[PDB]
Amino acid sequence: VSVQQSLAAYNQRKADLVNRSIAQMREATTLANGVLASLNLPAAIEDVSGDTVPQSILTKSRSVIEQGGIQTVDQLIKELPELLQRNREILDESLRLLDEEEATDNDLRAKFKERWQRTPSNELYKPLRAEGTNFRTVLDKAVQADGQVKECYQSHRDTIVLLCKPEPELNAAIPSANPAKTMQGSEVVNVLKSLLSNLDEVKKEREGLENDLKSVNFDMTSKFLTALAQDGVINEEALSVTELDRVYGGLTTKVQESLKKQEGLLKNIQVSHQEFSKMKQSNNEANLREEVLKNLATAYDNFVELVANLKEGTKFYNELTEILVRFQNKCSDIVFARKTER
């Protein structure tokens, strides 16, 4: 037993406590924000007009206008059969070269019998014909992909055209009426703002439950020595449990209560959210405004998916240009060399 042998013993445990609470504090904070963004919150009790057009929609509309519009798309669709057929004619001409030598060689071997000491004009052209069959299989998939995407385009063609044109003409399309009559006058809006403001108070209360926990410091060396003197040996584990639980009992309770309160609040708020967005139909005209925006989401995002397949293509044909030339000439080099000997 030396001069000092139980000083750092407590501080290590002090670290293994405060940090534990911080983890079970900040993690809960982020969890709340994630749910709000998923269910369109807290930005769902501010905008009210009906007549004017949305802001997010207005931004997406000008994005399509900025990148041309219906004209940029139509010119890409119309030129697809042009470029697709252009490659097809080169394909048939390349394969004709193989049939060319074979047509002459087959007739030559029949009449002139002295041509059986060399590789026939078939086995040499056999690996090349194997590549040829592969190409048409792609064309079937290329056309099939070309067909289904064109079908998806025409079904939502009117919606694409809708994206262009001036804004006032577009505004007339939007259902000019009150979004929901049961929002103004019913007790449904009132049982919502109060719920959020009560939940918001949790965030502000948590501000106090951070700096306080961080600045925890209380010297208590006298008690450890009391145990050393009275008992004889310092029991670090057993004595700490009885001591720390009593002094930091309410600190944990209020934290657990706040989490339990948040757990309790969120459970009732989620049901209120169901009650909040229940009246989609509402009275007579309300769901229609929602259905309008529903098609646009399936229009703007669909716009990207449709363009993406066009992006897969186009460049697809251009890189084929470098391939088909070396491919076509490769066959000619074999045929010409075969013709040279005789």
Swiss-Prot record:
It is found in: Cytoplasm, Cytosol; Melanosome; Cytoplasm, Cytoskeleton, Microtubule organizing center, Centrosome; Secreted, Extracellular exosome. The modification Phosphothreonine is found at T119. May be phosphorylated on tyrosine residues by activated PDGFRB. Residues 58-341 are annotated as: Interaction with SDCBP. Changing V138D: Reduces interaction with HIV-1 p6 and EIAV p9; abolishes rescue of PTAP-type L domain-deficient HIV-1 p6. Changing I323D: Reduces interaction with HIV-1 p6 and EIAV p9; abolishes rescue of PTAP-type L domain-deficient HIV-1 p6. Changing L320D: Impairs rescue of PTAP-type L domain-deficient HIV-1 p6. It comes from the Eukaryota. Changing C152A: No effect on interaction with HIV-1 p6; impairs rescue of PTAP-type L domain-deficient HIV-1 p6. Changing I323A: No effect on interaction with HIV-1 p6. Signal peptide: none annotated. The modification Phosphoserine is found at S121. Self-associates. Interacts with SH3KBP1/CIN85. Interacts with PDCD6 in a calcium -dependent manner. Interacts with TSG101 in a calcium-dependent manner; PDCD6IP homooligomerization may be required for TSG101-binding. Interacts with SGSM3. Directly interacts with CHMP4A, CHMP4B and CHMP4C. Directly interacts with CEP55 in a 1:2 stoechiometry. The interaction with CEP55 is required for PDCD6IP targeting to the midbody. May interact with PDGFRB. Interacts with SH3GL1 and SH3GL2/endophilin-1. Forms a complex with SDCBP and SDC2. Found in a complex with F-actin, TJP1/ZO-1 and PARD3. (Microbial infection) Interacts with HIV-1 p6. Interacts with HIV-1 p9. Multifunctional protein involved in endocytosis, multivesicular body biogenesis, membrane repair, cytokinesis, apoptosis and maintenance of tight junction integrity. Class E VPS protein involved in concentration and sorting of cargo proteins of the multivesicular body (MVB) for incorporation into intralumenal vesicles (ILVs) that are generated by invagination and scission from the limiting membrane of the endosome. Binds to the phospholipid lysobisphosphatidic acid (LBPA) which is abundant in MVBs internal membranes. (Microbial infection) Involved in HIV-1 virus budding. Can replace TSG101 it its role of supporting HIV-1 release; this function requires the interaction with CHMP4B. The ESCRT machinery also functions in topologically equivalent membrane fission events, such as enveloped virus budding (HIV-1 and other lentiviruses). It is linked to Microcephaly 29, primary, autosomal recessive: A form of microcephaly, a disease defined as a head circumference more than 3 standard deviations below the age, sex and ethnically matched mean. Brain weight is markedly reduced and the cerebral cortex is disproportionately small. MCPH29 is characterized by small head circumference apparent at birth and associated with global developmental delay, impaired intellectual development, speech delay, and behavioral abnormalities. Affected individuals also have poor overall growth with short stature, mild dysmorphic facial features, and seizures. This is Programmed cell death 6-interacting protein. It comes from Homo sapiens. The chain holds residues 361 to 701 of 868 of the full protein.
